[PDB]
């Protein structure tokens, strides 16, 4: 079998990706952030505290013939920008673009955090991490791919994200007409629980490219690009005006700047994230400051490759026996 599914920005800035999700008997269709950053698939719902929900669509399991409550099970996940939510369980039936699973964790928001209700266009997210960081206790449940993947194919799933455009998540699958040139495999470590690979350096601009190894997560529930203090400082200190903010939360450059390109390598093969993919707009309503698309990582603890970075490419999750992260430049 396969899916392929349509993943849009939620504003005009690339914010966040959504992608129809279809739960249940009869369908409810529910938008999703897709987060190969996380293990839960979880939804607003009907159980969800009234006060914390302001315009999405909820799952309501008691409308669903095929919903079972998964006795005893509940869920909680905080993420790396503080948000969180947490509720019970039910399975279900869940499909993506055409690819179906039974009996898929399901799990029903009882609360969520500020962030979460004040982004009306999150209905929840679907994470497409490794199993063993799901939250659901005290009976682990496993990710759509997870459950998808006998059935696929390819044990693989692709993200395509486009800038300030639509893209493609595809299950089981490669569209080889979706990328130029070939694809560089990379290997990739589990022992997090992440996508977690090693880049082998980076260019500003023009410039020379530094080779070095930098140890990140592909994440694409992650906005921006998160690199090493020495790495930001390098590609900020060629935008004149850049300037590290601590009131505003990282790096901001005047808005009337031509911002550099960024190159990053995989393997041999590099991934270059043009200078427009950096600029995430005034920091305020009419400021002429604008925020940086590239931050330091220096404080989360790990580098993150988010939607900056990987919607520069065409990305392969491939979840073979080992898994491993493809690249191609699109």
Do not use: M
């Not at 952030?33 to 914390?52: K, P, R």
């Not at 399991?61 to 095929?66: Q, R």
């Not at 140890?215 to 850049?242: E, F, K, M, N, R």
């Amino acid at each position: 079998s396969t899916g392929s599914a349509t993943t849009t920005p939620i504003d005009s800035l690339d914010d966040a990706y959504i992608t129809p999700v279809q739960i249940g008997t009869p369908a409810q269709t529910l938008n999703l952030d897709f987060d190969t950053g996380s293990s839960d698939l979880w939804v607003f719902s009907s159980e969800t505290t009234a006060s914390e929900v302001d315009g999405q669509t909820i799952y309501t399991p008691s409308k669903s013939t095929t919903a079972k409550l998964l006795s005893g099970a509940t869920w909680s996940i905080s993420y790396g920008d503080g948000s969180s939510s947490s509720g019970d369980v039910y399975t279900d039936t869940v499909s993506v673009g055409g690819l179906t699973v039974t009996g898929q964790a399901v799990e029903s928001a009882k609360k969520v955090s500020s962030s979460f209700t004040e982004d009306s266009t999150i209905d929840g997210l679907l994470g497409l991490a490794f199993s063993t960081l799901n939250t659901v206790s005290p009976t682990q449940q496993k990710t759509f791919f997870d459950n998808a993947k006998a059935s696929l194919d390819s044990p693989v799933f692709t993200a395509d994200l486009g800038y300030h455009a639509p893209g493609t998540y595809n299950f089981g699958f490669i569209d080889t007409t979706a990328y130029t040139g070939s694809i560089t495999y990379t290997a990739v470590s589990t022992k997090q629980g992440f996508w977690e690979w090693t880049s082998t350096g980076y260019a500003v601009g023009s410039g020379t490219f530094k080779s070095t190894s930098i140890d990140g997560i592909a994440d694409t529930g992650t906005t921006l690009l998160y690199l090493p203090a020495t790495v930001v400082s390098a590609y900020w200190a060629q935008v004149s005006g850049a300037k590290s903010s601590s009131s505003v939360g990282g790096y901001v450059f005047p808005c009337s700047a031509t911002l550099p390109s960024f190159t990053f390598g995989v393997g041999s093969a590099r991934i270059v994230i043009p200078g427009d993919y950096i600029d995430f707009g005034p920091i305020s309503t009419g400021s002429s400051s604008c925020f940086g698309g590239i931050q330091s990582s220096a404080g989360i603890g790990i580098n993150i490759f988010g939607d900056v970075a990987l919607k520069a490419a065409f990305v392969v999750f491939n979840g073979a026996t080992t898994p491993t992260l493809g690249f191609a430049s699109k």
